[PDB]
UniProtKB/Swiss-Prot annotation, chain A:
The modification Phosphoserine is found at S138. It comes from Homo sapiens. Keywords: Acetylation, Cytoplasm, Isopeptide bond, Phosphoprotein, Repeat, Ribonucleoprotein, Ribosomal protein, Ubl conjugation. It is found in: Cytoplasm. This is Large ribosomal subunit protein eL14. The modification N6-succinyllysine is found at K84. The gene is RPL14. The chain holds residues 2 to 140 of 215 of the full protein.
UniProtKB/Swiss-Prot annotation, chain B:
Its main location: cytoplasm. InterPro entries: Ribosomal_uL6-like, Ribosomal_uL6-like_a/b-dom_sf, Ribosomal_uL6_a/b-dom, Ribosomal_uL6_CS2. Keywords: Acetylation, Cytoplasm, Ribonucleoprotein, Ribosomal protein. It comes from the Eukaryota. Pfam families: Ribosomal_L6. GO terms for molecular function: RNA binding; rRNA binding; structural constituent of ribosome. It is found in: Cytoplasm. It comes from Homo sapiens. This is Large ribosomal subunit protein uL6. GO terms for cellular component: cytoplasm; cytosol; cytosolic large ribosomal subunit; cytosolic ribosome; focal adhesion; membrane; nucleus; ribosome.
From Swiss-Prot, chain C:
It is found in: Cytoplasm. This is Large ribosomal subunit protein eL33. The modification N6-succinyllysine is found at K62. InterPro entries: Ribosomal_eL33, Ribosomal_eL33_CS, Ribosomal_eL33_sf, Transl_B-barrel_sf. It is linked to Diamond-Blackfan anemia 5: A form of Diamond-Blackfan anemia, a congenital non-regenerative hypoplastic anemia that usually presents early in infancy. Diamond-Blackfan anemia is characterized by a moderate to severe macrocytic anemia, erythroblastopenia, and an increased risk of malignancy. 30 to 40% of Diamond-Blackfan anemia patients present with short stature and congenital anomalies, the most frequent being craniofacial (Pierre-Robin syndrome and cleft palate), thumb and urogenital anomalies. The gene is RPL35A. Keywords: Acetylation, Cytoplasm, Diamond-Blackfan anemia, Disease variant, Ribonucleoprotein, Ribosomal protein, RNA-binding, tRNA-binding. It comes from the Eukaryota.
Swiss-Prot record, chain E:
Constitutively monomethylated at His-244 by METTL18. Methylation at His-244 regulates translation elongation by slowing ribosome traversal on tyrosine codons: slower elongation provides enough time for proper folding of synthesized proteins and prevents cellular aggregation of tyrosine-rich proteins. It is not required for incorporation of RPL3 into ribosomes. This is Large ribosomal subunit protein uL3. Component of the large ribosomal subunit. The ribosome is a large ribonucleoprotein complex responsible for the synthesis of proteins in the cell. The keyword Acetylation applies. The modification N6-acetyllysine is found at K135, K285, K293.
Length: 139, 191, 109, 195, 348
RNA sequence: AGAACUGGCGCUGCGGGAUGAACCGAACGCCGGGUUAAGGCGCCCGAUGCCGACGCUCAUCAGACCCCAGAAAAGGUGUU
RNA sequence: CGUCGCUUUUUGAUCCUUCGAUGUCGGCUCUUCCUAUCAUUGUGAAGCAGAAUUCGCCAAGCGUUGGAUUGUUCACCCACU
RNA sequence: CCAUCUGUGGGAUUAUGACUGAACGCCUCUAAGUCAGAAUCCCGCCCAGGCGGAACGAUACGGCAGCGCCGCGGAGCCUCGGUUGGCCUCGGAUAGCCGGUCCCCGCCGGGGGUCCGGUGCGGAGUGCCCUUCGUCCUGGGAAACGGGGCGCGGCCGGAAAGGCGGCCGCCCCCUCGCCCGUCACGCACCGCACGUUCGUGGGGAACCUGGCGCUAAACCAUUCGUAGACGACCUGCUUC
């Protein structure tokens, strides 16, 4: 229970506001519900953000207490956050959730004519499992 | 004030082992087992460490009034660890006037029938909480020994004899009857 | 074959609290729930299809028992994104809640 | 067509504020298992302002007058009766589209109930403040049908657990049946385009 | 204001809608709710009152100034012929109370049974149940009839019994059987319905339900007295003789500002013919009516072991406005609701 | 009950104060579009269905918006 | 000695409504409500030994009479309770 | 009450008394959590049953019709509303979910290690029908259940308001019931709205039209008096 926290040096996804989608690194907390975060390699600069604006990750970092952009830019790219952010199963979701938004109308016809194929391939093959387990117990 | 975290830790002796469903505290000791789910209090229970068994209760954002109750978890755990190994023995002495207070026990230490109380011709059958037992106190006059595992099943039942023996429509500064709790000990001594 | 109109109920008249102004309805189309995203529907030509006793219809087809009251979206309304609209008649006040038909005409995008 | 609201965990007025607006727009909303409706504040307070509600009674004869309904379907139904303009015909026909059912009927137990996260006890109250059930304040006042209402729920939750076991019994195949490598192409077009 | 001398309310507001009751038979409002441990037995029963006598018994009650002295008590006798169980009615229970699940009636039904289904037995073709007694003979409709018992056993829970009175065995003119519908408080619903399919259209005597000196309840419709006024209905006091326009009335029927007559005020209407339930009536004796062969005839009712006479409970000259009892009876103690010749149900 | 300075009802509707002579806005030909005032924006009821900001607050008699519609001294190891 | 309120069951102050009429004292008859409770139930406190009393708490479910003189309201008295 | 008879129990709790127990290293009836608790309040019992719902019975031939169901076309008349459906876990919130050997449940599942995923992708911000324009020539992938349905017949399944849900076996029938390519054809009505679907909707009345069926009650009049202001109610009228 509570398997991750906030911490001096925690990568935090930002849900909404003017900085939606970008990652920030929690550097220092101020008072009960706000922080002092930054992201060097993701185009969002050092400022204060609320905690109900952001969204925790599983990426701890190793900072000093409230150091400059010079020493956050190191540990951001030394950890290779962006690759590790991309090839996890939570930026394959938000990217595919916006892959459906820019899915064009000709593309949906390529989807619908190809979705209704494989869902028939599975059905005449899940029936082949609906028959090889009844035949276990005909007697 | 809204403090970040308030916590107390709970040692567990090696002869007993607490496992938890969540906020349900399954305590399995030598003489019995017992359990208390805590869904009213919204605190996390984290046992930790092999071979040592430290239980750690910690409430992150409680208001003075919910920082108050994190001790009430761990003080209610140490009355199971102390209660599943020792178990609570309560001893009450009947202070009787000119009319002696008679008492018998019928159903295996569970039904206490209290007659000749203050000359009254009425019998008081005060059945007990499920899990406790009585005793006719050996080698001591007119005493009544209550045993069990959970202290709030013992003492609640043990209060139902002090409370049921009430001198009504009289004086209570004089007229002192009733079977008052006089000794709150355990089953195993010095352990 | 296939529906070519976004669904829309008729929600009320453009009122204060006591008096109502009959001259412009206000709608609630199915799908928008914020003023920031109703900009597609401004100017779209909307129609109230209903039934009555005789026939009177427009195309090559023979008249049957349907008649309509045309109209267009005027502007937005409120933060929650509903839409007021000014028909070339006034709504019969029976249509409260029953749907109208917001078409795909006036399509800029 | 019809929407089937579940009733457990919801607050009373926070639900019926939503329900009374979605019924003046022309839909049919069916509130199902309104027995388990939470209500705010501790239990003894909500009991008093429903016990003290029972003395609202016209003095010359009460057969005419304030019809105190006691079943917790008609408790919630009287709340929407307050928040609708039911004297007009525009509001009489906003109670023709509401049918709050006590427990779960056979028309609707093989439907999929919906929940509203704007009226839930989970979302809305701070977790350190007390609540009260519409279950046991309606039974405590008059509604003598608490036993035979919970008795029918375990006959519903018996034929549901065997259905939920057998839907995942059906569902366990279509992850393992999908295992065949024969249909490879029709997944280029969907992993690219929101599988 | 503030009446200066307090009184209690004349009449009671729990019996408030003083109505001509919409029924002539006493409807049991609530049967005794059963445990499934006790054996398979009924609750309520029919009987007609005939008249009253009194009694002399030797009381036994140590603690009073009464003990072991002869004590007269007013009794009332109620004639009960044996029934015939006809229908089996099964009730399922809902979140809206009970619900009649479905019924099964007996195979062949008797003559005064069919007389309740008409409002004119003379004119009518007597054609009730002629197409329902043809589901027992056919094996086409038989298996869908016993289909209606194994489903009755599976779903519904508080089944009951339809019976009625035998009207050839009474001195009345009435001849319609007062059909009733009474509950079996037996063991489990297995044993509850297993006891009834064996015994459709067989009789039920009164000494099979009731035990003597067990104290029971009577349900009946009161003596119909007419359209009576206030001093005879709510027993409000007569005004003194000098009163203009009227003596036998309530005077002030309410204050000013509640501009509206309360229900609580006493006023005139239809006294009598209400529905009531008398509680706690002990049965003094169960009688057996006109026994069979050996001797020309035997009366031998009301022949107590301290009297030893050839007597019977028909008083000398027959019962007034009833006739002459030939059958089983039940003698209750005290006053029992109704005219003579009126259906009044007994109940455990 | 009686006076002084100004305004208003009296002669005056209209939006608001749930309703209201005088209160806050604003004073009127007949209407189409636009915008606001005092006011408000869970549902009656047009409008917060904003991913509003920071706190205070448990009432077994909660509180809730000028005039305006029921209250004081004194007291509380309630709690800030 | 002070001092702060409540209630409209007393009287008073005021004249708002009713002078092309709201029939104005008491009693009898009768219903309902109030609680600031005389008795009753469940408790607490006593300068409560018991008994008899007094002050407080939840409380309007239930009761709160018969009589002499008076037009009486009020009074006072006998008597049960 | 000038004689007689009968009048009944449960639940949450108020006041108050406690228990465990912090806040406050001790104490505490309270802050979380528990217990006893009454003429109170609610309900039983009792009285009335609603612009409320069940269950069952009977359903109009005679000298003549007639009236139901199942399969029937055909037109008129009225009411209007909708343009695809989700066929179901339980619940948790300081957590829940999926997959899983072993022991315990009449040869399947309740109980623990173990393996996943978690701002929920085994995602109603989703899911499957699906936007299938019709049809032919003509190739490839997918396809051994064929699918419309007067079927024909069996079965058991779902009582809280079941008004539905499957299986198996036979039957006039099809091997074109999907996706991708080849070949063109159909009102191409010449820019234009009330388009497309539920739907051979729902309500009432006639005529030619097929089969299976059914052949009664209410109220008046009369009588009763268990009732009565009148109504209503209680009852009776067999060729014994």
């Amino acid at each position: 229970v509570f398997r991750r926290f906030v911490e001096v040096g925690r990568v935090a996804y930002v849900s909404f506001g003017p900085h939606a989608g970008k990652l920030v690194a929690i550097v220092d907390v101020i008072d009960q519900n706000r922080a002092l975060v930054d992201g060097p390699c993701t185009q969002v600069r050092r400022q204060a953000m609320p905690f109900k604006c952001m969204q925790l990750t599983d990426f701890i970092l190793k900072f000093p207490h409230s150091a400059h952009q010079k020493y956050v830019r190191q540990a951001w790219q030394k950890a290779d956050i962006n690759t590790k952010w991309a090839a996890t199963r939570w930026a394959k979701k938000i990217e595919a959730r916006e892959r459906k938004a820019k899915m064009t109308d000709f593309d949906r016809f390529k989807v619908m004519k190809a979705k209704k194929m494989r869902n028939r391939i599975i059905k005449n093959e899940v029936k082949k499992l609906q028959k090889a387990a009844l035949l276990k117990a005909s007697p | 004030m809204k403090t970040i975290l308030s916590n107390q830790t709970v040692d567990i002796p090696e002869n007993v082992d607490i496992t938890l469903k969540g906020r349900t505290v399954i305590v399995k000791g030598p003489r019995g087992t017992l359990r208390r789910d805590f869904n009213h209090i919204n605190v996390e229970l984290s046992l930790l460490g092999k071979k040592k068994k430290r239980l750690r209760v910690d409430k992150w954002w409680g208001n003075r009034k919910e920082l108050a109750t994190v001790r009430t978890i761990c003080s209610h755990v140490q009355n199971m660890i102390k209660g599943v190994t020792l178990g609570f023995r309560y001893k009450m002495r009947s202070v009787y006037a000119h009319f002696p207070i008679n008492v018998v026990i019928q159903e295996n230490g569970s039904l206490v029938e209290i007659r000749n109380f203050l000359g009254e011709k009425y019998i008081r059958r005060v059945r007990m909480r499920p899990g406790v037992a009585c005793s006719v106190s050996q080698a001591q006059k007119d005493e009544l020994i209550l045993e069990g595992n959970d202290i709030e099943l013992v003492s609640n039942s043990a209060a139902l004899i002090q409370q049921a023996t009430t001198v009504k429509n009289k004086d209570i500064r004089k007229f002192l009857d009733g079977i008052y709790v006089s000794e709150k000990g355990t089953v195993q001594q010095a352990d | 074959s296939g529906r070519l109109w976004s669904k829309a109920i008729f929600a009320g008249y453009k009122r204060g609290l006591r008096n109502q102004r009959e001259h412009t309805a206000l709608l609630k189309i199915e799908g928008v729930y914020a003023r920031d995203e109703t900009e597609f529907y401004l100017g779209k030509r909307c129609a109230y299809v209903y039934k009555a006793k005789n026939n009177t219809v427009t195309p090559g087809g023979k008249p049957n028992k349907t008649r309509v009251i045309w109209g267009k979206v005027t502007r937005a309304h409120g933060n929650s994104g509903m839409v007021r609209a000014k028909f070339r008649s006034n709504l019969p006040a029976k249509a409260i809640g029953h749907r109208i038909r917001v078409m795909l005409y006036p399509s800029r995008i | 067509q019809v929407l089937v609201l579940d009733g457990r965990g919801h607050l009373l007025g926070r639900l019926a504020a939503i329900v009374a607006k979605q019924v003046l727009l022309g839909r049919k909303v069916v509130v199902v298992r309104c027995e388990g409706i939470n209500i705010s504040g501790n239990f003894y307070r909500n009991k008093l302002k429903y016990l003290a509600f029972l003395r609202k009674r016209m003095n010359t004869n009460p057969s005419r007058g304030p019809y105190h309904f006691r079943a917790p379907s008609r408790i919630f139904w009287r709340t929407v009766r307050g928040m609708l303009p039911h004297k007009t015909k525009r509001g009489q026909a906003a109670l023709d589209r509401l049918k709050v059912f006590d427990g779960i009927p056979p028309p609707y137990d093989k439907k999929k109930r919906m929940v509203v996260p704007a009226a839930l006890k989970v979302v809305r109250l701070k977790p350190t403040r007390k609540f009260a059930y519409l279950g046991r304040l309606a039974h405590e006042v008059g509604w003598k049908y608490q036993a035979v209402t919970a008795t029918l729920e375990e006959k519903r939750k018996e034929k549901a657990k065997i259905h939920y076991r057998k839907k995942k019994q059906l569902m366990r195949l279509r992850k393992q049946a999908e295992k065949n490598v024969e249909k490879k192409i029709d997944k280029y077009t969907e992993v690219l385009k929101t599988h | 204001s503030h009446r200066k001398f307090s009184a209690p309310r004349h009449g009671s507001l729990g019996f408030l809608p003083r109505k001509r009751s919409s029924r002539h038979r006493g409807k049991v409002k609530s049967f005794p709710k059963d445990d499934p441990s006790k054996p398979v037995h009924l609750t309520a029963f029919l009987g007609y009152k005939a008249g009253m006598t009194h009694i002399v018994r030797e009381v036994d009650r140590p603690g009073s100034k009464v003990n072991k002295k002869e004590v007269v008590e007013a009794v009332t006798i109620v004639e009960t012929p044996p029934m015939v169980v006809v229908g089996i009615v099964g009730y399922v229970e809902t979140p809206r109370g009970l619900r009649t699940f479905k019924t099964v009636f007996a195979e062949h039904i008797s003559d005064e049974c069919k007389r309740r289904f008409y409002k004119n037995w003379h004119k009518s073709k007597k054609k009730a149940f002629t197409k329902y007694c043809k589901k027992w003979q056919d094996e086409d409709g038989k298996k869908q009839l016993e289909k209606d018992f194994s489903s009755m056993k599976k779903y519904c829970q508080v089944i009951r019994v339809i019976a009625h009175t035998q009207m050839r065995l009474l001195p009345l003119r009435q001849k319609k059987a007062h059909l009733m519908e009474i509950q079996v408080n037996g063991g489990t619903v297995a044993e509850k319905l297993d006891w009834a399919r064996e015994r459709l259209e067989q009789q039920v005597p009164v000494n099979q339900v009731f035990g003597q000196d067990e104290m029971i309840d009577v349900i009946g419709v009161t003596k119909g007295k007419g359209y009576k006024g206030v001093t005879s209905r709510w027993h409000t006091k007569k005004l003194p003789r000098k009163t203009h326009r009227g003596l036998r009335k309530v005077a002030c029927i309410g204050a000013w500002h509640p501009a509206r007559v309360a229900f609580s005020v006493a006023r005139a209407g239809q006294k009598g013919y209400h529905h009531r339930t008398e509680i706690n009536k002990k049965i003094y004796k169960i009688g057996q009516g006109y026994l069979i062969k050996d001797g020309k005839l035997i009366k031998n009712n009301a022949s107590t072991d301290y009297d030893l006479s050839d007597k019977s409970i028909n008083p000398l000259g027959g019962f007034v406005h009833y006739g002459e009892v030939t059958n089983d009876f039940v003698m209750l103690k005290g006053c029992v609701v109704g005219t003579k010749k009126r259906v009044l149900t007994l109940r455990k």
